[model samples]
Target: PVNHLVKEIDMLLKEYLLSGDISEAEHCLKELEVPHFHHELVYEAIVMVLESTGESAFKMILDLLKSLWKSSTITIDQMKRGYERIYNEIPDINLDVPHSYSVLERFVEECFQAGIISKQLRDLCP
Candidate 1:
C-alpha cells in the first residue's frame, strides 16, 4: 500500500515538474503520507523540481531541505551527494542569476554553521 502511494506521489511530482506548477507540487507533497524511509523519494522529487525550475525554486527547495533535516530524513552526506549529482548532471548551469549562487551559498553557509557538513562538503557548491 505504501509502495503504491509512493509511486502515486512520484507520478504527481513528475506531472508537477512537467507542468512547472509549484502549487501542484506542494499539493502533492501535502498529500504524501509516506514513512521516513521513503522521504528520500520526496527529496528526489524536490530536487527534480529545483533543477527544472532553476532560480525560482530556491525558497521552496530550502524550506523542504530544512524540513527534511529537522525530521532527520536527510543527512549531510546525502545532501552533499544530492547536490553533487545535480552539479554533475547540469554542468553548464548558469550561476550568474541573482538567486542561483546566492541561495546556494546561503544553504552551504547554513550547513556549515549547523556543523551539518564539513568544509570540504561546503566547498562543493559552485
Candidate 2:
C-alpha cells in the first residue's frame, strides 16, 4: 500500500553523504509529505548507512534519524516496523557486509539512548 517512495531515501542519503548537507536532505524529505510511508525511510536509512563506506557515514545517518525522530516526521510504530524489516534483513545482508551485525547493534543502541527507538529493540538485533 505504501510502496510509492521506495528508493527515494536511498538517493537522499547518497546526496546527503556526498554533498555534506543534512538540512538540505531533511528539507527534501519534508517536501515529499509521505509520512505514512516513513517506515521505509527508517528501513532505507539503516540499510544505506550500513551499506555505505566513507567518511562518518554512520553519524550522518544517525544525525538524520535523530532529527527526524525529534521533528516527529517519523513515529515509534514506523521506527519499530523498519527495525523489524532490517532485523530480518541482516541475515542476508551480513553475508556480504560481514560487519552488519555489529554496526546495526551499535545503531540500535544509539537510537535507544536518543529515545528514537523502543528500549526492547536494543536486544532485538542479530
Instruction: Pick the lDDT winner.
Output: 2
Q: Which stretches of candidate 1 lie over 4 Å from their true place?
A: 1-56, 95-117
What would the per-residue lDDT of candidate 1 be over residues 1-126, giving only the tens digit for each residue? 466765775686567545766555555555674443344553464454435444444445555555655655555666666666555633344442334355456656765676656788677766
**lDDT values, one for every candidate:** 0.55, 0.82
**Candidate 2 lDDT (Cα, whole model)?**
0.82
Error of 1 at 4 (Å): 10
Q: Estimate each model's TM-score.
A: 0.47, 0.87
Best by TM-score: 2
- C-alpha-based local distance difference test score of model 1: 0.55
